[PDB]
Design a protein around this ligand. Sequence first.
Ligand SMILES: C[C@H](OP(=O)(O)OC[C@@H](O)[C@@H](O)[C@@H](O)Cn1c2nc(=O)[nH]c(=O)c-2cc2ccc(O)cc21)C(=O)N[C@@H](CCC(=O)N[C@@H](CCC(=O)N[C@@H](CCC(=O)O)C(=O)O)C(=O)O)C(=O)O
Ligand SMILES: C[C@H](OP(=O)(O)OC[C@@H](O)[C@@H](O)[C@@H](O)Cn1c2nc(=O)[nH]c(=O)c-2cc2ccc(O)cc21)C(=O)N[C@@H](CCC(=O)N[C@@H](CCC(=O)O)C(=O)O)C(=O)O
Lengths: 140, 140
Amino acid sequence: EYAPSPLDWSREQADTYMKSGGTEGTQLQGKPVILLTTVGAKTGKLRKTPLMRVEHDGQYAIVASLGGAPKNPVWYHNVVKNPRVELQDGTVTGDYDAREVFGDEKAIWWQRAVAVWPDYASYQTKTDRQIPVFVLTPVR
Amino acid sequence: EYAPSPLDWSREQADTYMKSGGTEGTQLQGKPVILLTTVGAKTGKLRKTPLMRVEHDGQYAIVASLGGAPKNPVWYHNVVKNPRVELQDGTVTGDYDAREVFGDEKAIWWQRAVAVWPDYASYQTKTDRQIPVFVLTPVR
Ligand SMILES: C[C@H](OP(=O)(O)OC[C@@H](O)[C@@H](O)[C@@H](O)Cn1c2nc(=O)[nH]c(=O)c-2cc2ccc(O)cc21)C(=O)N[C@@H](CCC(=O)N[C@@H](CCC(=O)N[C@@H](CCC(=O)O)C(=O)O)C(=O)O)C(=O)O
Ligand SMILES: C[C@H](OP(=O)(O)OC[C@@H](O)[C@@H](O)[C@@H](O)Cn1c2nc(=O)[nH]c(=O)c-2cc2ccc(O)cc21)C(=O)N[C@@H](CCC(=O)N[C@@H](CCC(=O)O)C(=O)O)C(=O)O
């Protein structure tokens, strides 16, 4: 009662990430965090979203978890509509194309994500909604 | 003169800016440079555009001119359609609302811009078309 909401923390972390040029706000419980920029599905405004860092050979994966909620985070719809995103990993920023993965291809990235953030597994057991995963490829 | 083509240079400067987290690529002939993020008017894709830094009390101005050429840079149309932009000044990134300015209000910012980059004045004498200027106001 009177404490900030999980959404307030997320906003604050994003802000710190931006103000600091990727030097602060890059961690959550000692695990690395990236900053995603998406284009609003409806408004066309830039939205900043801290997410866990899941990386393999220059590609990143992002997970639309929101704890184990019934409904996807709003940013999920931004990525689907506008797959050109920006991902900042510490001081390094790049543009990427995002592609939702399914089945066996997803299970690969899902395992890599759980290795970074074990709670993802627990999130999935809390809900029948299949937690989306996108794979991000640098533009070349 | 062994200069790179203006497109290639722009891409490269933007890239350096992004890779370095605003620590490199922030200068052009000893004058400061910002990195503008816009949403494509038609595609909805993120575009990164290095521009001269023109600043006053937390607001920025940006000037739309490739030399004194007949047609506006294409990013001009992105800002008109999608006035919510991002501006990176060195390590600092923020969200801004952009509005095109005219008459007396423009002349104020035009003076500040010429102080930073005198060539702007010369660009305007090469064309009857009035070189656009936007004023960017922080939001959030
Ligand atoms: C070719 C095009 O680039 P541009 O026209 O944005 O280039 C303008 C240049 O000014 C920039 O490269 C700029 O970075 C250069 N520059 C500077 N330029 C300055 O002006 N001022 C400065 O102070 C400055 C400083 C500066 C300092 C260092 C440096 O390295 C460069 C600097 C492009 O990327 N094309 C791409 C993307 C274009 C795009 O955004 N496309 C939109 C299309 C929206 C549109 O145009 N809508 C209508 C237009 C119709 C109409 O106009 O009525 C349509 O296409 O139907 C989208 O994605 O949606 C492509 O073809 O794919
Ligand atoms: C409430 C909403 O948030 P959301 O995008 O649904 O999801 C909440 C997010 O904070 C949340 O998903 C993540 O940021 C939280 N989060 C992680 N969330 C995850 O899902 N996965 C992670 O791995 C993760 C890691 C993480 C690490 C650190 C941290 O601080 C937060 C982390 C929001 O930001 N609303 C904004 C923007 C909404 C938006 O994009 N609007 C759209 C359309 C909206 C409409 O249709 O009404 C538009 O502009 O077009 C607003 O209402 O103005």
